[PDB]
Amino acid sequence: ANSERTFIAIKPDGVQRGLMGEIIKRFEQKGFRLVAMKFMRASEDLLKEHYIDLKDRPFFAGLVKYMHSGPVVAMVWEGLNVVKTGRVMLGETNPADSKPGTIRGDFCIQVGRNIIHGSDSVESAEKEIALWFRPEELVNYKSCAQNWIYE
Amino acid sequence: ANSERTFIAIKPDGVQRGLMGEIIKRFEQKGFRLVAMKFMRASEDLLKEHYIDLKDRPFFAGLVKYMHSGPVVAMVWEGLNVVKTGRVMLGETNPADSKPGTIRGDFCIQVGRNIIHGSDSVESAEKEIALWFRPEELVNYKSCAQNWIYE
Amino acid sequence: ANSERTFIAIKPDGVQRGLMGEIIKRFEQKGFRLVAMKFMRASEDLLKEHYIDLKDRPFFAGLVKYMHSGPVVAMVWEGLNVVKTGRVMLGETNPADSKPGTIRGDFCIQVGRNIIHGSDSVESAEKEIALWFRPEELVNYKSCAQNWIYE
Amino acid sequence: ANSERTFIAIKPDGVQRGLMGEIIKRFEQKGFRLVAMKFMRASEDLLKEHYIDLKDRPFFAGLVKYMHSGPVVAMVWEGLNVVKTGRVMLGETNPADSKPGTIRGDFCIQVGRNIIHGSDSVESAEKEIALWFRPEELVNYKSCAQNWIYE
Amino acid sequence: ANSERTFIAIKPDGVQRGLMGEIIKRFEQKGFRLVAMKFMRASEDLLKEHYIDLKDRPFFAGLVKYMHSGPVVAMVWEGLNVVKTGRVMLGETNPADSKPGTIRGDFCIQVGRNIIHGSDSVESAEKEIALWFRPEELVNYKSCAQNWIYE
Amino acid sequence: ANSERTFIAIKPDGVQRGLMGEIIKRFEQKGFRLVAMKFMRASEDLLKEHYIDLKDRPFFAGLVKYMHSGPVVAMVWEGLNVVKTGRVMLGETNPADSKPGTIRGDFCIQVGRNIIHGSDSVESAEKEIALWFRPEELVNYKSCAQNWIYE
Numbered sequence: 001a002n003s004e005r006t007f008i009a010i011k012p013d014g015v016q017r018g019l020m021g022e023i024i025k026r027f028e029q030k031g032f033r034l035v036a037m038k039f040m041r042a043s044e045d046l047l048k049e050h051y052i053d054l055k056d057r058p059f060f061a062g063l064v065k066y067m068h069s070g071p072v073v074a075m076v077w078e079g080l081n082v083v084k085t086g087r088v089m090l091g092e093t094n095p096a097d098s099k100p101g102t103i104r105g106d107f108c109i110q111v112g113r114n115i116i117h118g119s120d121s122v123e124s125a126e127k128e129i130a131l132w133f134r135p136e137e138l139v140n141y142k143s144c145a146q147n148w149i150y151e
Numbered sequence: 152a153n154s155e156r157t158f159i160a161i162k163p164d165g166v167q168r169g170l171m172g173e174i175i176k177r178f179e180q181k182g183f184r185l186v187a188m189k190f191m192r193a194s195e196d197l198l199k200e201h202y203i204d205l206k207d208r209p210f211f212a213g214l215v216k217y218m219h220s221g222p223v224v225a226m227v228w229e230g231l232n233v234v235k236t237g238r239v240m241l242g243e244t245n246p247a248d249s250k251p252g253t254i255r256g257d258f259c260i261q262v263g264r265n266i267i268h269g270s271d272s273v274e275s276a277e278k279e280i281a282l283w284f285r286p287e288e289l290v291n292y293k294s295c296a297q298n299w300i301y302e
Numbered sequence: 303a304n305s306e307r308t309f310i311a312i313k314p315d316g317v318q319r320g321l322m323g324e325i326i327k328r329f330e331q332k333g334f335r336l337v338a339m340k341f342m343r344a345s346e347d348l349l350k351e352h353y354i355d356l357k358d359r360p361f362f363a364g365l366v367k368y369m370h371s372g373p374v375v376a377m378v379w380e381g382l383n384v385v386k387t388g389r390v391m392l393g394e395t396n397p398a399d400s401k402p403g404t405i406r407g408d409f410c411i412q413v414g415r416n417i418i419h420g421s422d423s424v425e426s427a428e429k430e431i432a433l434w435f436r437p438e439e440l441v442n443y444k445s446c447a448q449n450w451i452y453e
Numbered sequence: 454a455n456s457e458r459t460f461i462a463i464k465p466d467g468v469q470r471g472l473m474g475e476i477i478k479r480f481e482q483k484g485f486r487l488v489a490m491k492f493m494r495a496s497e498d499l500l501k502e503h504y505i506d507l508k509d510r511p512f513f514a515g516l517v518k519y520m521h522s523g524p525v526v527a528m529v530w531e532g533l534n535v536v537k538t539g540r541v542m543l544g545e546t547n548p549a550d551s552k553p554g555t556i557r558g559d560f561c562i563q564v565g566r567n568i569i570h571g572s573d574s575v576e577s578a579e580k581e582i583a584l585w586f587r588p589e590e591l592v593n594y595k596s597c598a599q600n601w602i603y604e
Numbered sequence: 605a606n607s608e609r610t611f612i613a614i615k616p617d618g619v620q621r622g623l624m625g626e627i628i629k630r631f632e633q634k635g636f637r638l639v640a641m642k643f644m645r646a647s648e649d650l651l652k653e654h655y656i657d658l659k660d661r662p663f664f665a666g667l668v669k670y671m672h673s674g675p676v677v678a679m680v681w682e683g684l685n686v687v688k689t690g691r692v693m694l695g696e697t698n699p700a701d702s703k704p705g706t707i708r709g710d711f712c713i714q715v716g717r718n719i720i721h722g723s724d725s726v727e728s729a730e731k732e733i734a735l736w737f738r739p740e741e742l743v744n745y746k747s748c749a750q751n752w753i754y755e
Numbered sequence: 756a757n758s759e760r761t762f763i764a765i766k767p768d769g770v771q772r773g774l775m776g777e778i779i780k781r782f783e784q785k786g787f788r789l790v791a792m793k794f795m796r797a798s799e800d801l802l803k804e805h806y807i808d809l810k811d812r813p814f815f816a817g818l819v820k821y822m823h824s825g826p827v828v829a830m831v832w833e834g835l836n837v838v839k840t841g842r843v844m845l846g847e848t849n850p851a852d853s854k855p856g857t858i859r860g861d862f863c864i865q866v867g868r869n870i871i872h873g874s875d876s877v878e879s880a881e882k883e884i885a886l887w888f889r890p891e892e893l894v895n896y897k898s899c900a901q902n903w904i905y906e
């Protein structure tokens with residue numbers, strides 16, 4: 001299940017804030033593997049289809065707006081239990097609740113300014129990933145050490 | 152209400168131990184604003200009122216001595232729920248119980264050499280701040296990050 | 303003139319080395335804006351095209367080779383003097399003369415496995431980008447600290 | 454009681470992972486004195502002896518196995534409460550429940566490849582050392598900041 | 605003569621940019637002793653005398669403005685050839701020319717946003733120190749590290 | 756020549772200072788491989804045979820003395836050109852001359868308090884290594900990536 005994959009976006013702040021590598025490096029060092037990845041400017045349109053569930057939801061409005069407001073880091077990571085796991089590294093959605101050593105616990109404060117999103121699960125993963133990527137953008141390759149990360 | 156402030160000092164142990172740059176580094180990193188700070192040797196007087204409610208603690212004159220046994224770094228940091236948050240960053244009063252990822256957590260073993268203090272509550276913060284600093288010393292300014300951290 | 307660009311690429315071994323957020327960090331922290339970024343497999347055509355000046359020399363398709371055996375992180379970083387400075391950051395072309403502080407002087411040992419590549423002139427630069435990115439991938443945005451980095 | 458000891462070992466994958474100075478760092482920065490350290494190949498006898506409590510369970514010689522396929526960094530770290538605290542630093546035994554801040558929560562994903570090991574009682578502790586080090590390898594010295602770490 | 609001191613301030617750019625903890629962190633790291641430090645907004649008066657010899661520089665009122673455009677961190681650090689050394693750590697006046705590994709080096713692009721100042725010479729240090737600090741503010745103490753850093 | 760090996764000792768200060776991992780991690784991340792390694796207390800005797808050339812040399816006297824004065828990190832590293840290379844990472848013997856990004860440039864100040872030694876060359880390597888180690892202490896094994904470090 002080591003081929004599990006999750007979608008991680010470093011949000012507009014993430015980006016202005018200068019936490020790009022930092023974040024990426026946490027995943028790298030934990031042992032997961034970047035499958036896909038590009039720097040973009042989510043479309044309004046996308047943000048809307050991405051954020052559709054939670055559409056008619058106050059916040060909404062301006063989520064897109066800010067989400068749209070800047071370039072983000074679209075990323076796909078691979079590994080055993082990344083969805084779960086990446087969600088921990090992340091921290092709680094509201095930074096108020098995240099803790100030290102997590103991503104958001106360490107560098108952010110407030111919810112509307114969350115620095116990053118991770119899929120909430122495989123079902124999600126799939127959708128977003130599908131929704132965010134093109135088949136080709138995904139890249140098959142193997143580690144220099146699948147052996148020391150997994151048995 | 153992103154004006155809440157907190158008092159934080161860095162014990163002699165922190166100082167002697169070289170932990171400034173890192174302590175500071177974590178608050179700069181999470182996003183809070185340094186409103187004042189100086190590096191001094193606090194007086195027994197100062198310590199004694201700072202540590203007033205613990206005057207009936209046997210530790211109490213131990214603290215007071217060691218807390219005056221070398222330079223310390225006083226500071227006020229501000230931001231939204233910066234008093235709770237800071238605490239959490241801090242670790243727990245007893246290092247024994249502070250989670251890795253917390254200052255206390257990676258850096259200190261014991262209660263009496265627990266390198267740092269941060270306010271316990273906003274009233275306490277008002278106090279200590281008043282105690283430690285002249286209002287003048289506190290720097291009123293705006294953050295570049297400002298809009299990126301805050302909604 | 304804060305507009306100059308450079309093309310940075312993370313060679314397939316630096317990715318394999320879990321050196322991406324690390325090097326991406328060096329950039330960001332130096333002050334550079336990220337224009338465009340992608341993770342991917344370089345094609346033989348692109349690569350050939352890319353290494354064209356040296357189509358004869360020995361090392362050649364051993365280049366193309368390696369160069370196409372894994373993913374790279376392809377990037378475009380902006381800023382005053384990106385191209386010469388980038389350079390100086392990567393350090394020299396053969397790791398061994400690379401100096402402690404540079405990417406290469408810090409992480410890699412031999413010329414043939416030298417984690418990354420940066421355009422060596424704007425000239426090259428201009429070409430490198432042209433070749434590697436569609437234009438719809440250059441991102442147009444203003445930084446948080448434009449006016450902290452520049453006079 | 455600042456004398457308690459613990460036995461830490463860097464499993465052959467964490468070495469393979471270039472995680473040694475990293476984890477050694479976590480210790481040192483937390484405040485612990487290093488009593489004894491060695492790099493080496495664990496023998497089958499030692500290892501068998503070492504994993505004795507579990508000679509039956511499945512995972513068993515797959516332990517012994519891995520465990521003898523590479524070098525480990527064998528260490529003894531001193532200090533108040535090394536053994537429980539060490540623990541809390543490594544994080545849980547299965548990486549996935551390991552938390553961001555711990556060695557395991559930061560660097561590793563699966564139980565079977567979990568970078569390191571620490572004695573889980575002083576009891577174990579005492580045995581672990583006894584087994585792994587000759588006595589002529591425990592180093593007797595006083596720290597620079599004995600009296601900054603301890604009351 | 606391990607008493608030599610130097611003045612170092614951290615520009616508004618450094619401050620706004622979050623580089624305190626790191627700047628401090630490098631001096632704590634190399635081994636020098638922080639003798640005083642405060643965080644203030646310097647006055648044009650202050651800046652103007654500080655920057656006196658450059659009063660005939662066109663940059664001069666640019667500096668003066670920006671140097672007063674936000675809080676700064678003044679400090680005196682001491683140790684053996686701390687004035688030359690510090691400089692070297694610093695980087696070069698022009699970031700363009702400062703070697704990776706230097707503060708200037710990893711962190712700043714341009715001459716007018718070059719985040720930091722450190723004394724050019726001991727006479728200059730005496731001056732600036734006098735300028736910036738009241739003698740009282742400077743902390744006289746001894747280092748734990750003391751004998752470890754010094755013969 | 757990728758089997759070249761050099762002797763690196765983290766000196767008594769190195770040790771009290773808490774730079775153990777740090778240093779080790781520079782070698783790890785640069786790509787070299789630890790062949791041998793133990794924490795010890797050099798004998799006077801050893802220090803004498805080690806430091807014999809430069810015997811009847813003022814300094815001498817007390818070099819042993821301090822060298823002897825504390826436990827050190829005996830280490831053996833492997834890689835292409837480690838002798839040379841490790842010597843750069845190191846910095847100049849006198850820290851006064853080392854630069855930022857080097858080991859000693861970054862963390863030490865004065866010569867008698869040098870934090871570490873590296874062999875000055877293959878001839879040296881051999882001798883010290885021989886002199887410091889027992890055949891068995893050396894450990895043959897191969898990387899999880901000799902492939903991405905060397906071609």
Ligand SMILES: Nc1nc2c(ncn2[C@@H]2O[C@@H]3COP(=O)(O)O[C@H]3[C@H]2O)c(=O)[nH]1
Pocket residue numbers: 059063093111112113114116117118302
């Ligand atoms: N202002 C605001 N933003 C929210 C709230 N709940 C969720 N969001 C955002 O909605 C995002 C959707 O999931 P994310 O993982 O992207 O992180 C979430 C938050 O940034 C809320 O109550 N207020």
Ligand SMILES: Nc1nc2c(ncn2[C@@H]2O[C@@H]3COP(=O)(O)O[C@H]3[C@H]2O)c(=O)[nH]1
Pocket residue numbers: 210213214244262263265267268269604
């Ligand atoms: N020696 C000692 N100091 C204590 C004890 N409990 C609290 N402290 C010290 O006194 C403190 C009061 O506030 P702090 O926030 O600084 O953190 C605690 C330590 O500095 C105790 O039981 N023993």
Ligand SMILES: Nc1nc2c(ncn2[C@@H]2O[C@@H]3COP(=O)(O)O[C@H]3[C@H]2O)c(=O)[nH]1
Pocket residue numbers: 361365395413414415416418419420
């Ligand atoms: N194997 C090998 N690769 C080389 C040699 N010189 C340059 N290169 C490689 O080819 C690359 C061309 O420029 P890079 O910036 O990509 O840095 C160079 C190295 O990857 C050489 O002598 N041998």
Ligand SMILES: Nc1nc2c(ncn2[C@@H]2O[C@@H]3COP(=O)(O)O[C@H]3[C@H]2O)c(=O)[nH]1
Pocket residue numbers: 512516546564565566567569570571
């Ligand atoms: N493969 C595998 N290894 C396990 C299991 N549980 C514990 N271990 C390993 O055996 C080790 C015994 O204690 P460690 O501290 O060394 O941590 C444990 C892991 O390396 C399991 O279910 N599977």
Ligand SMILES: Nc1nc2c(ncn2[C@@H]2O[C@@H]3COP(=O)(O)O[C@H]3[C@H]2O)c(=O)[nH]1
Pocket residue numbers: 453663666667697715716718720721722
């Ligand atoms: N804009 C500008 N500032 C300069 C120039 N030369 C020096 N400086 C600034 O003025 C400085 C004088 O001392 P500093 O040490 O702070 O570093 C230099 C920068 O802050 C220049 O040519 N242009």
Ligand SMILES: Nc1nc2c(ncn2[C@@H]2O[C@@H]3COP(=O)(O)O[C@H]3[C@H]2O)c(=O)[nH]1
Pocket residue numbers: 755814818848866867868869871872873
């Ligand atoms: N005090 C002092 N120590 C020195 C001098 N020259 C060399 N040493 C030490 O001699 C050591 C021998 O080589 P090292 O690589 O171990 O690093 C050297 C220095 O620590 C000198 O002129 N004075």
